[PDB]
Amino acid sequence: PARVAIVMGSKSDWATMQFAAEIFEILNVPHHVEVVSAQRTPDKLFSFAESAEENGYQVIIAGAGGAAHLPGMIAAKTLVPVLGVPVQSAALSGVDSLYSIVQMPRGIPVGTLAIGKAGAANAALLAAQILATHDKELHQRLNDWRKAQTDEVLENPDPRGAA
Amino acid sequence: PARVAIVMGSKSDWATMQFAAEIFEILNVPHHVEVVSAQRTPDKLFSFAESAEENGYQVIIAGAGGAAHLPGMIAAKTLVPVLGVPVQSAALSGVDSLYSIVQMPRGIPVGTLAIGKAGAANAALLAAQILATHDKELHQRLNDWRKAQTDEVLENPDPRGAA
Amino acid sequence: PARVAIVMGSKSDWATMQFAAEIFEILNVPHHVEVVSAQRTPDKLFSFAESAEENGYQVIIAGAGGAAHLPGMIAAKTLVPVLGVPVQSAALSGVDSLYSIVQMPRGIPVGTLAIGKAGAANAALLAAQILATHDKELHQRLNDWRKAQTDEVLENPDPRGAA
Amino acid sequence: PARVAIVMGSKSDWATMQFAAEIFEILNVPHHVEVVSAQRTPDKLFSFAESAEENGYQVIIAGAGGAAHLPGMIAAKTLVPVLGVPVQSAALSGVDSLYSIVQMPRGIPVGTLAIGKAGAANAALLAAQILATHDKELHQRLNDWRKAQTDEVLENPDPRGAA
Amino acid sequence: PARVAIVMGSKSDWATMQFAAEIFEILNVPHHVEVVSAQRTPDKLFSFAESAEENGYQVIIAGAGGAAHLPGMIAAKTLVPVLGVPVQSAALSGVDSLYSIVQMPRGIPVGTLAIGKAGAANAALLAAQILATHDKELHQRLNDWRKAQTDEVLENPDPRGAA
Amino acid sequence: PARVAIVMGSKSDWATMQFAAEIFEILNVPHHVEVVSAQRTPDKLFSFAESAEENGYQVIIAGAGGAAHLPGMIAAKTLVPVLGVPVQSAALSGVDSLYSIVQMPRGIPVGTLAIGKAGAANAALLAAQILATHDKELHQRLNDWRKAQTDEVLENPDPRGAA
Amino acid sequence: PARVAIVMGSKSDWATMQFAAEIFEILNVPHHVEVVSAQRTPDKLFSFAESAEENGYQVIIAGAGGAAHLPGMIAAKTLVPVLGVPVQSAALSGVDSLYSIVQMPRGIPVGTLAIGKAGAANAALLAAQILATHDKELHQRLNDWRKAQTDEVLENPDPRGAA
Amino acid sequence: PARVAIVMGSKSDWATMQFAAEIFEILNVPHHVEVVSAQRTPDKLFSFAESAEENGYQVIIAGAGGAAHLPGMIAAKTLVPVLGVPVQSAALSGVDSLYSIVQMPRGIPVGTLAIGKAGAANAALLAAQILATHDKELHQRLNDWRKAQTDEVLENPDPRGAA
Numbered sequence A, B, C, D, E, F, G, H: 001p002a003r004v005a006i007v008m009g010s011k012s013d014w015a016t017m018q019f020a021a022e023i024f025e026i027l028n029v030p031h032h033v034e035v036v037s038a039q040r041t042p043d044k045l046f047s048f049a050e051s052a053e054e055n056g057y058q059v060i061i062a063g064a065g066g067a068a069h070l071p072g073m074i075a076a077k078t079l080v081p082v083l084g085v086p087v088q089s090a091a092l093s094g095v096d097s098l099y100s101i102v103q104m105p106r107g108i109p110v111g112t113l114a115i116g117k118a119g120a121a122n123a124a125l126l127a128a129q130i131l132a133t134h135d136k137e138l139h140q141r142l143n144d145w146r147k148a149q150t151d152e153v154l155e156n157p158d159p160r161g162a163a
């Protein structure tokens, strides 16, 4: 069963959040994907967050741009850990998204990743690290994936064009 | 009856939001004041915003600091106009509050005022201007209040210490 | 009659402010549109703001970029509520516009929306919400428009390409 | 046994990180606390991160200020999930700390919380939420703690001085 | 006669603008000082700027804080050169003041000085440099003042406590 | 004779500073144009600033990007008034240029205009306003130019496409 | 032998760091180039920095983008002077890179250059200046290179198109 | 003889730059200290930088606040390596100082350290690292100083109050 949900405020956010989904495809981690807006579908948000525990989610990754309320509002309504991905916004280049996600007051946390597609990939990796604490197989695939990333850099030390 | 509600994410916000209440005392505008947190009391927020129309509110002023979700979440759940006051936060000096309130995406507006006590006073004045469109008496008191503010500056053109 | 005016500092601002006009076309709200510059036509600004009440305006939406003086100067000269739209500027990406509109001192408010076309659309929606407090028909169309926006997201929960 | 470590770049950071420790005292979660500097004790950092899995840690909370390398360098060396707390710095008010923690590139995540003591408390709460996925007792205490926080706001709706 | 006017949006700005007045006292340059608010006394602003030429002003120094409209609105209404002093604001530390003064669009300039009391002193010095182009005596006093400032640094090269 | 010099740190700055030159062509104001770098030609800078008075300059406009030292270093070496134009830089979008020009300490002023081509045009207009205080003909052309700009906006109040 | 190493967090950084290499080609300074990631190859970083002294390096230039840990982590592990080049990042335009490199706490320095390709070129020039203190030939080539840069500006004072 | 000079734009900067001097006292490195202002003593700056090589300096540390021109102007006039310390300014908290020092264009480098007293200490340490490349004794004292700093953290792993 899917132990992680990837949600996002808008279809346009998929350009960014697809990179979280890609990590899970690589690591063979079942996941659910859904557009849930704090602003445009507030009642669905509430029912989504209320049922997350009972639906079997152990991590929720939420992405949004601009005044990014989605991740914090999910976190207000569930004990399932929430990771937040700030989507790059046009004018403020995701600074608004970042401040509106990370600056949660005491009592209702959201673990925040980097602005944009690097943070989407990292949210899925952090979610996978969380899951891997109690899933030996996934822990192994993660270790393999990390080693592969390190080996790629190690076997290519010179960035210049071939001799 | 009270046609405006002043709400805020925390009791600590009252140091700032009191300045909105002061404007209404001056203009004799009945108002309701309440601590409503998007993060700490999400279900109350929803019921507050859902009932605002039926409770007779025509403007809601919402103040919050940090990742300020309160004003936008109220606006998502009611057609009653929402004005947002960014409370000055410790580290980011209300920049986080300002970006998290003003940068609402298309579809769910929050009219935002200045960071801190000047924005609290201005939110109440803008709310009073909105009400005064259909309240001749209040329009008159506003006009009187404005004239008094202008006259104060006009009768004191020299800022230096007396001769 | 038109109960809202949309004004802007320059013709170039129309690329942004057109999105406010679009909302009003959708909601069938009569509106006036005009280029009024605080800097290039200061005397027209003064006469525009002075006559707004007598011309029947109940909300003014003002857009400008850079050192954005237009919305605040209108507000200084009329009791008609002013909503400000920060236009995205080249170098500072509308941060200058946002600070120059939102940071009004105590006494002369401007309700500020998001930088750029999302704030233009939201200003018109907030203006329509203000008008809808005393216009049952408009209140209904707004409710319909909101429901349509929510339904669009609800009927499209999966952002991925079709099976 | 302690399933969470709280580490920080300097003794001076304890003024902030104590607030993470406080959450764990409240929730009765055993924890380890240590000063580990990426810059001043790089070899200890490496051995700390290398042994974290074998020492039984399931979450690491790392706090640092300025050019905050500690959390990301821990994360580079272990699969144990890392939460980062940006400590408020003098000149840049923790903006440097926040950017240096949150903006990790793809491959090595750090879940980041708010600048300063609110983020320290939230990191411990997020760590506790992570642990509570497989610890029914802790899940219960968390639920109790949340309810207590909500009830406090609910039973005190009026922020004004007593009648 | 006074060839320079020092104006400011509020009496509170005098704490800053006094430093412009001090330069003129030192250089024996007659000057006029007045509180003129774009926001609170818009009609006085217009009449002030309209009459400046006829009143004999050759430079106007305008100081304001927050959404600082005063200098740009003066400049819109007169050909007399306007220098703008951004007053340090509470939350944004004069960044708002600076952006709202300096970012004037093409056609209506305001020469902007540093945030706060250093910019007030510099505005008066720049105004004096402008006047000194056609006033040999003032040019001489300026030269004397500059030499005195240079000599002070030159005769005190070691910043350490006396032997 | 030329009473204004337009100088700039690099040939690449001409893309921006050309807009100052354009104003002077329009107003028929003789001007000198030169590349002078504080960093790459420090001795020329010194001799340029030292001789400016004797060469007949009454205003100097200096443009530079990045760590923009040119305007302030000219001002340190001459009593001729200096206006500074921050050129838009790649990474920081002229914010670096703006802070490095405007934030001069007490004693050595530089009147600063907007980032980029609007500030270049405005520097020339402010320089022309300075010159026009003692040049009736130029004062007249300026007045004509301003009226033309105002008339353009006035005769085009509707920004929408023709009926 | 090579007395300078140019290292960078990723192959993608070569687009920027190539400009450091170009300076060394011009000045005929032997150099080593390598991709070394603090995050993706932490153990290689440690062995690289540990052996730098013994490998004959007298300056290390390190470039990285985003949460840029590379330069500071090298500096933590060697006494060889480290110069840091902030690579321009997508969302934050190298501001993150700059803060994460320059804001090192007391005890472990990194001399930081400008964001992007200008800082890469300058790091190599500063490294060459450091080496030239004890290398008369290199000192001479540097002097020649500087003179050539100054002469280029001097022989091209007019930036306008040929007569 | 003194192989390093510590210079600063003003006596007030000594509060910060004293921390560079302290490092040199600890490491027994002879040094020269002087107030040299780019703005207030431009001719002294030029003669200082011109003679630095002949006076035996191998590193110059320059501190300044605000529009910080000193370090870059020294670097324009000498091949002796220049390290820049941004002094914390009142309004902009040393951000202006940092941008005006670090953002040097290609050709004239300044190695920049952290804002404020930590950067002053680090500039002296980086200068000492540069000198230590050819001074075995100083290299040894540096190594000793580093080890002492590491040992301090290592022997104090628990930041909490004694049992």
Ligand SMILES: Nc1c([N+](=O)[O-])ncn1[C@@H]1O[C@H](COP(=O)(O)O)[C@@H](O)[C@H]1O
Pocket: A008, A009, A010, A011, A012, A013, A036, A037, A038, A039, A040, A063, A064, A065, A066, A067, A068, A069, A070, A071, A087, B105, B106
């Ligand atoms: N922040 C947010 C929420 N929310 O926080 O609930 N819902 C949509 N949004 C944001 O609106 C931004 C623009 O959405 P759209 O107008 O392109 O549909 C998206 O980045 C989306 O995440």
Ligand SMILES: Nc1c([N+](=O)[O-])ncn1[C@@H]1O[C@H](COP(=O)(O)O)[C@@H](O)[C@H]1O
Pocket: A105, A106, B008, B009, B010, B011, B012, B013, B036, B037, B038, B039, B040, B063, B064, B065, B066, B067, B068, B069, B070, B071, B087
């Ligand atoms: N933003 C917010 C919300 N909310 O947006 O729903 N609830 C509380 N807060 C903010 O937490 C900040 C600190 O609250 P407290 O920890 O002092 O109770 C306050 O400014 C409050 O507005």
Ligand SMILES: Nc1c([N+](=O)[O-])ncn1[C@@H]1O[C@H](COP(=O)(O)O)[C@@H](O)[C@H]1O
Pocket: C008, C009, C010, C011, C012, C013, C036, C037, C038, C039, C040, C063, C064, C065, C066, C067, C068, C069, C070, C071, C087, E105, E106
């Ligand atoms: N801010 C402003 C005012 N005003 O505040 O009165 N008038 C024009 N402007 C701004 O100049 C900016 C550029 O105008 P333009 O040079 O393209 O005509 C526009 O965004 C316009 O809103």
Ligand SMILES: Nc1c([N+](=O)[O-])ncn1[C@@H]1O[C@H](COP(=O)(O)O)[C@@H](O)[C@H]1O
Pocket: D008, D009, D010, D011, D012, D013, D036, D037, D038, D039, D040, D063, D064, D065, D066, D067, D068, D069, D070, D071, D087, G105, G106
């Ligand atoms: N960032 C950092 C690291 N590190 O990232 O490894 N070690 C110490 N620091 C920071 O130096 C800052 C000042 O430390 P100190 O000079 O007061 O000991 C602290 O906030 C500490 O976290």
Ligand SMILES: Nc1c([N+](=O)[O-])ncn1[C@@H]1O[C@H](COP(=O)(O)O)[C@@H](O)[C@H]1O
Pocket: C105, C106, E008, E009, E010, E011, E012, E013, E036, E037, E038, E039, E040, E063, E064, E065, E066, E067, E068, E069, E070, E071, E087
């Ligand atoms: N900006 C401005 C204008 N104006 O631009 O016309 N009038 C007052 N202000 C500003 O309100 C700020 C606070 O004023 P006050 O509320 O202390 O009277 C002052 O810095 C003043 O300059």
Ligand SMILES: Nc1c([N+](=O)[O-])ncn1[C@@H]1O[C@H](COP(=O)(O)O)[C@@H](O)[C@H]1O
Pocket: F008, F009, F010, F011, F012, F013, F036, F037, F038, F039, F040, F063, F064, F065, F066, F067, F068, F069, F070, F071, F087, H105, H106
């Ligand atoms: N700031 C500056 C100085 N100076 O302040 O003396 N000289 C060149 N510069 C700047 O280098 C920037 C890039 O110059 P270049 O590398 O394209 O020649 C230009 O914007 C120029 O103004």
Ligand SMILES: Nc1c([N+](=O)[O-])ncn1[C@@H]1O[C@H](COP(=O)(O)O)[C@@H](O)[C@H]1O
Pocket: D105, D106, G008, G009, G010, G011, G012, G013, G036, G037, G038, G039, G040, G063, G064, G065, G066, G067, G068, G069, G070, G071, G087
């Ligand atoms: N900062 C950093 C480190 N490090 O600090 O050790 N390693 C890679 N990076 C950065 O990841 C950024 C993107 O890398 P990549 O995802 O394109 O490979 C690069 O700018 C690189 O310098």
Ligand SMILES: Nc1c([N+](=O)[O-])ncn1[C@@H]1O[C@H](COP(=O)(O)O)[C@@H](O)[C@H]1O
Pocket: F105, F106, H008, H009, H010, H011, H012, H013, H036, H037, H038, H039, H040, H063, H064, H065, H066, H067, H068, H069, H070, H071, H087
């Ligand atoms: N930046 C600068 C220069 N300069 O760059 O040549 N000279 C003085 N300053 C700065 O003026 C600031 C205030 O100086 P003062 O008005 O307190 O004497 C100081 O930080 C000093 O470094």
